[PDB]
Structure 1
Amino acid sequence: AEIYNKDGNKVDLYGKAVGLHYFSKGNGENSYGGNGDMTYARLGFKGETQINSDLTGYGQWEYNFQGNNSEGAAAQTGNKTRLAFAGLKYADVGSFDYGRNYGVVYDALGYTDMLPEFGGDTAYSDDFFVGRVGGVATYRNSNFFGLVDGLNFAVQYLGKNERDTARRSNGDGVGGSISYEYEGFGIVGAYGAADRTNLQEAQPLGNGKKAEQWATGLKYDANNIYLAANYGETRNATPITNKFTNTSGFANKTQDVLLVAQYQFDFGLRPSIAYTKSKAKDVEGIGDVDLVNYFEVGATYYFNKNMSTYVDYIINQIDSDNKLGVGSDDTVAVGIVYQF
């Protein structure tokens, strides 16, 4: 909600209180989504000042407050900053911004990252360029310097983040994305590569000195319809865990596919059919094993811009003997959303 707009500066204060519960069977970790209460809230600000007609500055911070902890010592679990960055936008030369933000390959992966609750499975956090990272400098240009409507690109520089954990670290890397949109059609390509930190290299799973990820995207988004497809591959980047052994590291390679079809009824309903498969190849010891494999069916009802409800059902195709331990049970999720 735009709570401030004066003298060139305009501030948007935003957030949401999401009452959400997941249903599975088990103890719920042969399931996809797990099980039980998963309520949470979000708070953020989006600022934008007009330094002059050509020049704009902006900043953004967004936090996540879990809503299913007790008020004891574990109160904070799951709490974190998703985004925190500032930057400048100059006439048609481009925008530049620095901070904790979405990696460039997410430029592609975001196409199919639209289910009511699940989806976007290959867009992991703190994972080189596919999801939200820390320390990235991102240059983005639109319509090629104002000369070609609809043709955009970006380059992104990723700084080393030697973290406690091999799962959330990264060496320096570079990535870029090119994308073209026209009359409801959108096509994208993204690619980044990086150095892996020493601790990454010590993990029993995956061998290599460099982290690569790329992804392609195609989409039709007009006339209330939304059809979208992503296809991408990664070398030494996706984190995997062998639950039997408890070993962990990165998949040597992954081939990933995501398809999404949605329709927006004018009375509020948005049915969604989606399909996702991601499989790791040449896993030291295991061979070819699926990480993610499912059909998804779901609906969002929008009462208005502020209120909505949804159900998201994962028909999990992962099978039961999965040699990494990936759980095979469906999960259903029901949520009620207030946002401003």
Structure 2
Amino acid sequence: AEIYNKDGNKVDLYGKAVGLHYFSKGGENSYGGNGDMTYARLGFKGETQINSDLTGYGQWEYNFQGNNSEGADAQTGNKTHLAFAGLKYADVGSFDYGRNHGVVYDALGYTDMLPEFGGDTAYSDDFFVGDVGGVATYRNSNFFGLVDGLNFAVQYLGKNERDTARRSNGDGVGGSISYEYEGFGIVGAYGAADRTNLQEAQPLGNGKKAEQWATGLKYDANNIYLAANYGETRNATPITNKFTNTSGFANKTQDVLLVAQYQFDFGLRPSIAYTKSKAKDVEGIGDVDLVNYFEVGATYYFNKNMSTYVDYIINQIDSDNKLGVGSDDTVAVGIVYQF
């Protein structure tokens, strides 16, 4: 919803309301939990034409949880999702700074396409794989205008020293390259950064640096969407040992995400997917699976504004998992109004 269009500044206000329920057995041992998951989003996006070659922009978006009560748990899950401003110049590129997506999410975005679940390895406040605070990002499209379909990015992750180790990071750099051609895209992305002393001081995870890289292919044409991601992390992936009640990072993970979808004309969009992430060299455990499931789902788009969906996670994690990762299935049902 464009609330402003004058003298080359446009602002859009946008938002959505997501009625959502998760169904698991009893669901502390399930993939996604059990119960009401309703939530809403609000945000704006602005773009100003400063001169013929130079445009400025900003975006903000907030998540309000709607599955809390009015009492002490009222703001649980609320958060800024995005908040950044930048400048884009004719064929030089663009620069922005704020709370934005890590550059490795340029690869991991390929498979983050399921109705409700998926994108399990694109953690937030996790260096370069998801939403992080304090990233400057340089981006270039069509390689300075010289090569159509050829994009690249370089990102400086600023150190965030937070109270918990799970949410902290040190100084870091990363980058990405994508090519897109006749329906297809290929991408690679990499980032490395310091761990904070508090992260170091965790039982799980040993190393002075964190590292995350991923590659991906996708096909997005003829009503079809197909993608594959492969990824590898060192000292970077957050883990918890539910038996010993300890927390930290996986010394190494190996990540596979695959997704296949088809979009019917009349709005039905079936989906199948697979996610496996394996931890290795975990203090006191050795090797252990973090995520391992198949997904079957569908979204029904009535139009640009309304949709319903059901998302089934056939959970292949096993009951005797060494970290306590939950092994039960989850089904999500959702109804979305957005503008």
TM-score using structure 2 length: 0.99
1:73, distance to aligned residue in structure 2 (A) = 2.2
**Within 1, Cα distance between the matches of 2:233 and 2:197?**
19
1:167-216 alpha-carbon deviations (Å, 9 max, x no partner): 00000000000110001110000000000000000000010000000000
- Name the Cα RMSD after superposition: 0.5
**Within 2, Cα distance between the matches of 1:250 and 1:135?**
21
1:231-273 alpha-carbon deviations (Å, 9 max, x no partner): 0000000000000001110000000000000000000000000
For residue 107 of structure 1, give the secondary structure of its aligned residue in structure 2.
helix
**Within 2, Cα distance between the matches of 1:75 and 1:233?**
37
For residue 145 of structure 1, give the secondary structure of its aligned residue in structure 2.
helix
1:74, distance to aligned residue in structure 2 (A) = 1.6
Q: Which residue of 1 aligns with 2:170?
A: 171
1:69, distance to aligned residue in structure 2 (A) = 0.7
1:250 aligns with 2:249: yes
**Within 1, Cα distance between the matches of 2:268 and 2:54?**
40
1:58-110 alpha-carbon deviations (Å, 9 max, x no partner): 00000000001111122111111000000001001000000010000000000
1:3, distance to aligned residue in structure 2 (A) = 1.8
TM-score using structure 1 length: 0.99
1:52, distance to aligned residue in structure 2 (A) = 1.5
1:33, distance to aligned residue in structure 2 (A) = 0.5
For residue 236 of structure 2, give the secondary structure of its aligned residue in structure 1.
coil
1:308, distance to aligned residue in structure 2 (A) = 0.3
Identify unmatched segments of 5+ residues in structure 1.
none
For residue 198 of structure 2, give the secondary structure of its aligned residue in structure 1.
helix
For residue 108 of structure 1, give the secondary structure of its aligned residue in structure 2.
helix
For residue 73 of structure 2, give the secondary structure of its aligned residue in structure 1.
coil
Identify unmatched segments of 5+ residues in structure 2.
none
1:4, distance to aligned residue in structure 2 (A) = 1.4
1:29, distance to aligned residue in structure 2 (A) = 1.1
For residue 110 of structure 1, give the secondary structure of its aligned residue in structure 2.
helix
For residue 200 of structure 1, give the secondary structure of its aligned residue in structure 2.
helix
**Within 2, Cα distance between the matches of 1:75 and 1:318?**
32
Equivalent pairs counted in the alignment come to: 339
**Within 2, Cα distance between the matches of 1:47 and 1:12?**
6
4+ runs of 1 displaced by more than 4 Å? Answer: none
1:7, distance to aligned residue in structure 2 (A) = 1.4
**Within 2, Cα distance between the matches of 1:240 and 1:138?**
27
Percent identity at matched positions?
Answer: 99
1:28-64 alpha-carbon deviations (Å, 9 max, x no partner): 1100000000100000000011112211000000000
For residue 68 of structure 1, give the secondary structure of its aligned residue in structure 2.
coil
